[PDB]
From a paper:
The FAD-dependent oxidoreductase from Chaetomium thermophilum (CtFDO) is a novel thermostable glycoprotein from the glucose–methanol–choline (GMC) oxidoreductase superfamily. The structure of CtFDO reveals an unusually wide-open solvent-accessible active-site pocket with a unique His–Ser amino-acid pair putatively involved in enzyme catalysis. A series of six crystal structures of CtFDO complexes revealed five different subsites for the binding of aryl moieties inside the active-site pocket and conformational flexibility of the interacting amino acids when adapting to a particular ligand.
PESB interacts via a hydrogen bond with Asn562 and via WAS with flavin, His564 and Ser607 (‘in’ conformer). PESB is further stabilized by vdW interactions with FAD, Ala133, Val135, Leu399, His466, Leu474, Tyr476 and Asn562. The formic acid molecule makes the same interactions in S1 as in CtFDO:MAMB, and WAS (HOHA804 in chain A, HOHB817 in chain B) adopts an almost identical position as WAS in CtFDO:free (shifted by 0.2 and 0.5 Å for chains A and B, respectively). Subsite S2 of CtFDO was found to bind only aromatic moieties (the thiophene moiety of PESB). Different moieties of the bound compounds use the individual subsites differently. The CS, which is located in the narrow passage of the pocket, binds both aromatic (MAMB, the pyrrole of IPEA and the benzothiazoline of ABTS) and aliphatic (formic acid, PESB and IPEA) moieties. Ser607 in the ‘in’ conformation participates in binding the active-site water molecule (CtFDO:free and CtFDO:PESB), formic acid in the S1 subsite (CtFDO:MAMB, CtFDO:PESB and CtFDO:IPEA) and in the catalytic site (CtFDO:4NP).
Author numbering: 46 to 630
Write the structure that this text describes.
């Protein structure tokens, strides 16, 4: 018997478990699918980055109707610390209107204003050295970055010289320096804040900052290498869970909570727990002979990710050193590793293949001459066309409300819809941050070891291709600007300067886009039940008591940026909500 059981030991699960166990009268069990990492160089050292160590095995998509029916390997964490243990350590808040929009969907107490103190509470920013800030153009607003919270973040202590050419090129094509991308807008270029502890130049993942930090606590229990297979009920009250070994041994165990069950199993895990437990669409549950506890057609609907594109380049005059010097120059690689091992300086403080700066842009910044044409197309098309016919009408209503919020974001000069990056080597990256497409994640069986059916439905909403084509063209502007032309870049096949029309460009993008940056969200959405929502504004699952969703399954839609910073802050916020209801310390 525990006070709380948390299903999943990732960013949201560990943050919540940490905060709840600050009260010695409160016991928590975190049940986590994956093992404890072993402090491998691939995890702790940015330059050694090896995310594949703890990928969840045997997840593959359905054929992707929007991407030439390609099937893709699905990437999500299976490890204590979840995504934080194996992600690229990119630490960015969303824009103000992301959180304001979540509130306006019918979620009282959700706004930029209510989130800011939880962003601050979550973290400790360590400033870079003054010479690197000056040379690098590293800026921040100390007033809105935390100084006392457990997540350490800072910057690498080095930049590849080519990052200078790219910064100036970006400035030449209307991506100006951003004072602080953590201040609720990020229109232009800025240094990437990195979830690194500057004392050791090592990863500050949730395993460290929300478990190891507090693991002397006898009330903070962890069970790695087990799966929560089902929620247990007395009537509509969630009272416990069944768990099994992740390795598939024919064993099942029941464990009980006096106060609540929290789901923290992520975008691809939480909906499976709900559906196996009879919380989900009665059509699916009836087909599988699962007794319905709560008929919620939103469970496993509204899947979102942030598609990526990798654009290959050749250079006649690239500057040495660059990120690819680490792979192609054994001498450079040895000297940089020796340097890191001695004085913790140099290229090994940067996540392997990344550079130090990045660019985010609104729709009107990407497409200043045409953004109103894209908005008109999106406005003209019924929200229902983005979903299969027969989609539950509550789910269509919630999608329409999300869509109307995103079209306002499209009109907003201060909300990002795309990211541009150049690692300093043979490729650039373009990320689509705000897809209008929605996918699904549904169980195929009652067997808790069976992968769910994962259908991203990337590029099914035709507006996504118009936005993404505009983002591609802006990246092309950066590479053609005078500061980059000195390095002699040219797009390589299957891209190329000879692809000049939207149709020629998008035909190649349809074959190369990745549905996912492992940013899966929004499959147990926080919206009103009559809008196809799964959880209330307090993250309580509709139709049952003592059951909440903490992981980014609860998000209505994707941010202007990567999810990690908000996964921490959203868990900080929920810890206080739970403490308030249950009168905890
Ligand atoms: C390789 C890679 C790279 C990136 C990213 C992810 C990944 C995998 N992301 C995304 C980001 O890390 C991710 O969105 C967050 O970790 C989500 O936090 P959650 O708490 O929702 O899930 P998270 O995935 O952290 O945790 C869920 C946990 O539940 C466990 N689990 C699932 N089913 C279970 C069950 N039935 N029982 C028990 N446990 C169960 C899983 O094992 C996992 O540890 C990212 N973001 C960003 O901002 N910056 C970045 O650089 C990156 N890069
Ligand atoms: C990571 O952030 C934590 C939390 O603010 C920092 O921990 C503090 O460290 C100082 C100096 O070691 C101590 O005097 C404080 O008592 C610590 N506070 C807590 C709550 O732990 C740590 O310094 C940060 N890392 C870096 C590089 O600054
Ligand atoms: C899925 C995973 N994604 C990341 O590492 C995030 C990467 C990320 O945010 C950024 C990279 C550059 C600027 S920002 C992954 C793993 C392996 C290969 N490809 C992708
Ligand atoms: C994808 O497969 C479907 C069959 O389900 C087919 O109708 C369609 O033409 C295919 N698309 C492409 C681009 O081949
Ligand atoms: C920093 O910005 C200045 C312009 O203010 C520019 O001259 C310089 O090249 C930039 N350096 C880097 C590394 O971005
Ligand atoms: C698991 O054990 C139970 C009880 O012995 C048994 O009924 C069932 O056949 C077993 N399942 C498998 C796959 O071994
Ligand atoms: C390889 O890296 C070393 C170490 O910095 C450098 O001296 C050398 O010029 C590099 N070789 C090439 C071919 O770039
Ligand atoms: Mg200093
Ligand atoms: Na409820």
């Amino acid at each position: 018997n525990y006070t709380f059981i948390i299903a999943g030991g990732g960013i949201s699960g560990l943050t919540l478990a940490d905060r709840l166990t600050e009260d010695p009268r409160v016991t928590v069990l975190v049940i986590e699918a994956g093992p404890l990492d072993r402090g491998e160089d691939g995890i702790l050292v940015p330059g050694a980055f090896s995310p594949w160590l703890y990928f969840w095995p045997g997840l593959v998509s359905t054929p992707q109707a929007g991407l030439n029916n390609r099937t893709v390997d699905v990437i999500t964490a299976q490890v204590v610390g979840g995504g934080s243990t194996i992600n690229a350590m990119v630490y960015l808040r969303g824009d103000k209107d992301d959180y304001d929009s979540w509130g306006a969907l019918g979620n009282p107490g959700w706004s930029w204003n209510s989130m800011l103190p939880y962003f601050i509470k979550s973290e400790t920013f360590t400033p870079p050295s003054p010479e690197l800030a000056a040379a690098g153009n590293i800026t921040w607003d100390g007033s809105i970055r935390g100084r006392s919270g457990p997540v350490n973040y800072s910057y690498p202590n080095y930049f590849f010289p080519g990052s200078e050419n790219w910064w100036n090129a970006a400035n030449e094509v209307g991506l100006p320096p951003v004072k602080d991308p953590m201040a609720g807008s990020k229109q232009g270029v800025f240094w990437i804040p990195s979830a690194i502890d500057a004392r050791t130049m090592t990863r500050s993942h949730a395993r460290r900052n929300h478990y190891d930090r507090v693991s002397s606590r006898p009330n903070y229990h962890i069970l790695p290498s087990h799966l929560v297979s089902k929620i247990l009920f007395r009537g509509k009250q969630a009272i416990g869970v069944s768990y099994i070994p992740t390795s598939g041994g024919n064993t099942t165990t029941n464990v009980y909570a006096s106060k609540e069950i929290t789901l923290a199993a992520g975008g691809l895990g939480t909906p499976k727990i709900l559906q196996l437990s009879g919380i989900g669409p009665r059509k699916l549950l009836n087909e599988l002979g699962i007794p319905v506890i709560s008929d919620l057609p939103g469970v496993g609907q509204n899947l979102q990710d942030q598609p990526t594109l990798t654009i290959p380049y050749t250079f006649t005059n690239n500057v040495f050193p660059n990120t690819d010097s680490l792979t192609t120059n054994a001498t450079y690689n040895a000297e940089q590793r020796a340097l890191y091992d001695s004085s913790k300086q140099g290229a090994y403080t940067i996540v392997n293949s990344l550079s130090t700066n990045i660019g985010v842009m609104s729709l009107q910044r990407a497409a200043p001459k045409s953004y109103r044409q894209i908005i008109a197309a999106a406005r003209a098309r019924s929200a229902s066309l983005s979903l299969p016919p027969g989609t539950d009408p509550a789910v269509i209503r919630g999608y329409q409300a999300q869509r109307n919020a995103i079209l306002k974001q499209f009109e907003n000069p201060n909300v990002g819809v795309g990211t541009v990056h150049w690692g300093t080597g043979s490729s650039a990256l373009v990320y689509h941050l705000k897809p209008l497409s929605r996918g699904t994640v549904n169980i195929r069986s009652t067997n808790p070891l069976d992968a769910p059916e994962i259908d991203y439905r990337t590029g099914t909403d035709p507006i996504d291709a118009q936005v993404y084509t505009s983002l591609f063209r802006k990246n092309r502007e950066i590479f053609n600007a005078p500061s980059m032309r000195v390095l002699g870049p040219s797009e390589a096949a299957p891209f190329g300067a000879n692809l000049t029309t939207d149709e020629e460009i998008y035909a190649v993008m349809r074959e190369l886009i990745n549905p996912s940056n492992a940013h899966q969200c929004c499959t147990a959405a926080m919206m009103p039940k009559d809008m196809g929502g799964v959880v209330s504004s307090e993250q309580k699952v509709y139709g049952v008591q003592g059951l909440r969703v903490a992981d980014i399954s609860f998000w209505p839609f994707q941010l202007s940026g990567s999810p990690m910073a908000t996964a921490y802050a959203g868990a900080e916020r929920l810890a206080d909500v739970i403490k308030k209801e249950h009168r905890l310390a």
